[PDB]
Amino acid sequence: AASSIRMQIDSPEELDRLDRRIIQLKLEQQALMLDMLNEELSDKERQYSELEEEW
Amino acid sequence: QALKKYTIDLTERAEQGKLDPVIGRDEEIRRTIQVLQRRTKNNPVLIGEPGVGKTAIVEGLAQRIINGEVPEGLKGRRVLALDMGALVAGAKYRGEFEERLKGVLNDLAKQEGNVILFIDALHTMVGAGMDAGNMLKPALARGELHCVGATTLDEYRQYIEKDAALERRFQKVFVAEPSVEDTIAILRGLKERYELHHHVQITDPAIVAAATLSHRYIADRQLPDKAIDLIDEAASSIRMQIDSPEELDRLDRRIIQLKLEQQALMLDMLNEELSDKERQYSELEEEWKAEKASLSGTQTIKAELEQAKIAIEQARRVGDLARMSELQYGKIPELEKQLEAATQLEGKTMRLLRNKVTDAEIAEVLARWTGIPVSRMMESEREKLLRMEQELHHRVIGQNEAVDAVSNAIRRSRAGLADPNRPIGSFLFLGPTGVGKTELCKALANFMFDSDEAMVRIDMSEFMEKHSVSRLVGAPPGYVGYEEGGYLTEAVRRRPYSVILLDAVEKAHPDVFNILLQVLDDGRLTDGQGRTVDFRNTVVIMTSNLGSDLIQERFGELDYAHMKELVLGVVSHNFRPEFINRIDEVVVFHPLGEQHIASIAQIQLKRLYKRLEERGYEIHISDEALKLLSENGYDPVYGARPLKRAIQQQIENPLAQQILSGELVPGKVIRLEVNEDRIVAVQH
Numbered sequence: 001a002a003s004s005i006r007m008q009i010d011s012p013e014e015l016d017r018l019d020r021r022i023i024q025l026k027l028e029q030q031a032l033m034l035d036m037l038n039e040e041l042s043d044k045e046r047q048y049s050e051l052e053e054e055w
Numbered sequence: 056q057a058l059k060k061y062t063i064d065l066t067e068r069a070e071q072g073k074l075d076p077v078i079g080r081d082e083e084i085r086r087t088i089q090v091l092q093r094r095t096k097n098n099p100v101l102i103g104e105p106g107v108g109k110t111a112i113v114e115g116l117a118q119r120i121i122n123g124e125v126p127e128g129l130k131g132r133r134v135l136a137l138d139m140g141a142l143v144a145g146a147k148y149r150g151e152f153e154e155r156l157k158g159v160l161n162d163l164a165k166q167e168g169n170v171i172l173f174i175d176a177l178h179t180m181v182g183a184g185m186d187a188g189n190m191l192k193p194a195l196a197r198g199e200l201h202c203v204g205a206t207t208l209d210e211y212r213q214y215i216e217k218d219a220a221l222e223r224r225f226q227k228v229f230v231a232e233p234s235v236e237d238t239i240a241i242l243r244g245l246k247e248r249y250e251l252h253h254h255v256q257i258t259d260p261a262i263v264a265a266a267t268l269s270h271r272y273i274a275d276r277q278l279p280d281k282a283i284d285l286i287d288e289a290a291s292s293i294r295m296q297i298d299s300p301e302e303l304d305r306l307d308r309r310i311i312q313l314k315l316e317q318q319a320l321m322l323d324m325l326n327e328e329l330s331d332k333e334r335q336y337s338e339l340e341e342e343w344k345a346e347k348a349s350l351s352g353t354q355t356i357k358a359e360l361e362q363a364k365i366a367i368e369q370a371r372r373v374g375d376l377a378r379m380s381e382l383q384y385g386k387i388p389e390l391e392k393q394l395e396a397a398t399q400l401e402g403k404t405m406r407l408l409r410n411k412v413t414d415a416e417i418a419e420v421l422a423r424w425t426g427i428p429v430s431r432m433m434e435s436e437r438e439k440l441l442r443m444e445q446e447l448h449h450r451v452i453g454q455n456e457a458v459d460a461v462s463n464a465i466r467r468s469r470a471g472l473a474d475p476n477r478p479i480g481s482f483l484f485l486g487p488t489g490v491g492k493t494e495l496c497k498a499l500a501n502f503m504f505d506s507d508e509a510m511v512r513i514d515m516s517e518f519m520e521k522h523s524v525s526r527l528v529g530a531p532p533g534y535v536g537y538e539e540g541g542y543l544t545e546a547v548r549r550r551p552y553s554v555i556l557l558d559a560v561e562k563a564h565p566d567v568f569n570i571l572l573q574v575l576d577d578g579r580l581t582d583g584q585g586r587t588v589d590f591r592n593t594v595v596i597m598t599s600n601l602g603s604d605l606i607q608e609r610f611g612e613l614d615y616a617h618m619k620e621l622v623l624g625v626v627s628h629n630f631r632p633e634f635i636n637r638i639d640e641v642v643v644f645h646p647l648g649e650q651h652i653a654s655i656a657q658i659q660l661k662r663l664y665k666r667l668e669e670r671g672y673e674i675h676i677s678d679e680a681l682k683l684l685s686e687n688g689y690d691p692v693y694g695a696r697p698l699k700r701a702i703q704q705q706i707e708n709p710l711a712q713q714i715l716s717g718e719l720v721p722g723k724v725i726r727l728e729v730n731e732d733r734i735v736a737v738q739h
């Protein structure tokens with residue numbers, strides 16, 4: 001149980017969801033080079049940076 | 056640096072792509088990570104049956120280390136598999152082997168726990184050269200050495216929990232056999248791997264049929280290994296079927312035959328026939344080369360697609376930006392669409408050939424692994440199987456009921472409708488003496504294999520004591536007959552799809568019936584060594600004669616079902632209730648009547664004709680002599696054998712008498728016409 005809590009502290013899920021989302025939208029925005037995705041990606045990067053600093 | 060000398064860097068092979076995509080297994084990899092970070096017991100050992108992907112799960116842990124799905128304390132570790140081989144390959148002197156091994160251990164202490172060591176075959180590791188693993192012992196539970204074990208189920212019980220000196224180190228990780236659909240999920244990342252090596256395409260119905268039929272029928276080995284075996288071996292089957300052809304062989308033999316014929320004739324016409332067949336041969340050769348070139352281009356471009364996927368995972372580890380969108384949205388969909396253009400092109404052009412792997416291929420490959428007809432219905436075996444009643448009545452004349460029940464049992468096992476928790480049919484042949492019980496079982500053996508003596512016929516009347524269970528099942532370990540094992544639990548583990556006759560079962564001592572309860576409950580049977588044999592492809596038939604007085608008394612003027620219930624109560628007096636609760640169908644015979652005995656007389660006279668035709672004496676018979684046999688070889692108390700040995704006596708004694716006399720020359724037809732009482736053999 002100590003190892004389980006050590007894993008859940010040291011390693012989060014929403015950060016993985018946000019990182020996959022920003023790299024996927026980075027793929028799409030690099031493909032499109034209509035956009036709107038600079039703005040969406042900037043919002044999700046700001047949210048990711050906030051959650052990262054809180055972590 | 057001995058680390059570069061005698062270790063396999065699995066992180067190197069993980070980054071180089073020399074490993075395999077591990078699918079699922081999040082729970083067990085997570086529990087391995089748990090045991091890797093404790094205070095004491097910092098050495099997980101994996102416990103699984105042999106062939107459930109233990110090394111695969113360790114390499115999947117290694118790829119999650121590379122991909123960074125681990126906690127931060129494991130980010131940057133090194134996975135080193137200890138090379139057993141190169142250490143031994145130069146050893147000559149006193150402990151120079153262990154000198155190298157101790158140098159590697161001092162280098163691991165130098166690496167200060169930043170290297171996660173992995174040594175599989177842990178039961179072999181404990182003695183491999185103070186010998187090989189108890190040099191290590193203080194460094195294990197102190198944060199110095201973190202060797203990760205991975206070893207077999209029984210050998211864990213051999214060399215680990217018995218050797219309790221190191222037992223406060225390692226931890227059980229029961230790597231279970233994954234289910235059917237999980238193995239389907241495994242192969243859908245390994246379908247793509249096996250298509251680079253066998254140059255053929257694999258179809259998803261074949262994968263789901265491979266997983267299901269492997270999990271049901273091959274009971275020695277286990278998932279996920281056996282499904283991989285079926286897929287790989289059927290890929291080899293289709294690779295060979297492509298790599299031949301057949302019409303080229305026909306045309307080549309024909310043109311070299313007509314070439315020799317025309318060269319002999321040097322009327323002709325064979326210059327013209329030869330030129331026509333040579334043009335046909337050139338056409339088929341050019342079509343064959345075109346199909347080979349088509350498959351070559353398809354496989355090269357599919358390998359290009361796979362290397363594109365490998366390079367884009369390399370970029371995902373690296374993190375280039377335009378390379379990602381470039382490789383993805385350029386390379387992947389255009390190679391997929393021209394790969395499928397090649398797929399429909401091969402759907403157009405492959406005529407001569409099966410480019411792909413169907414589920415019938417898995418059926419054939421499995422049917423050569425065991426013998427169970429998982430093969431689809433051809434014309435021969437299907438028409439042979441539909442006339443089951445006519446075949447068994449053209450050996451076992453008489454006894455409609457058991458033939459009906461047995462025919463229905465084997466049909467319900469070929470069509471798949473049989474429960475895979477019980478055997479195909481557990482039968483209990485009651486009835487009086489001499490009425491074709493053992494010949495019904497020989498009739499099934501001669502239908503199923505085309506052989507009378509191809510059935511595990513264990514007579515039960517050798518089992519009249521308490522060491523009889525040691526005879527049939529096996530001998531417990533460390534005794535005299537440990538090396539051979541039993542006669543039943545070995546003669547089925549070789550040959551699954553067979554018939555197991557237990558003749559005269561009531562004469563045996565009832566702990567043998569405890570063993571038969573274990574058989575008809577599980578289908579797996581435990582021997583002295585320990586491993587079990589799946590009896591769910593066999594047909595256990597037990598004969599007896601327990602109700603002989605009651606059936607010979609009362610089967611006349613009584614119905615069928617109440618007779619079955621009455622003699623079943625008699626059996627409940629003899630057997631156990633939990634035993635005969637576990638029987639498919641207790642078919643109960645009837646004594647043989649006159650028309651039946653006339654037919655049995657005709658069968659025995661036919662086999663006598665075959666014997667004296669191999670001897671070289673053709674024999675006709677008058678039907679009055681058949682009536683003499685019917686009136687001498689008939690009585691209800693004994694069944695059919697008075698007929699057989701009355702035939703033996705009254706025919707064969709004057710006949711073989713005169714054949715030894717030299718009176719009867721071969722060539723003429725012996726007419727067995729009647730005497731006033733005897734049967735004379737005449738020559739005319």
Ligand SMILES: Nc1ncnc2c1ncn2[C@@H]1O[C@H](COP(=O)(O)OP(=O)(O)OP(O)(O)=S)[C@@H](O)[C@H]1O
Binds near residue numbers: 110112283
């Ligand atoms: N999760 C998985 N993902 C992909 N392939 C797998 C997976 N599990 C097993 N396999 C395959 O099954 C094979 C089993 O390899 P091994 O781990 O060597 O087998 P094993 O269970 O370790 O038995 P031994 O002792 O090593 S012979 C692997 O090499 C893979 O091809």
Ligand SMILES: Nc1ncnc2c1ncn2[C@@H]1O[C@H](COP(=O)(O)OP(=O)(O)OP(O)(O)=S)[C@@H](O)[C@H]1O
Binds near residue numbers: 451492494
């Ligand atoms: N319908 C039948 N067709 C052919 N042979 C038969 C038939 N019924 C009986 N027999 C003969 O019966 C003989 C006795 O064989 P068995 O099967 O051993 O006798 P059973 O009546 O089935 O019972 P037991 O206990 O084995 S003596 C065989 O040699 C067969 O030739």
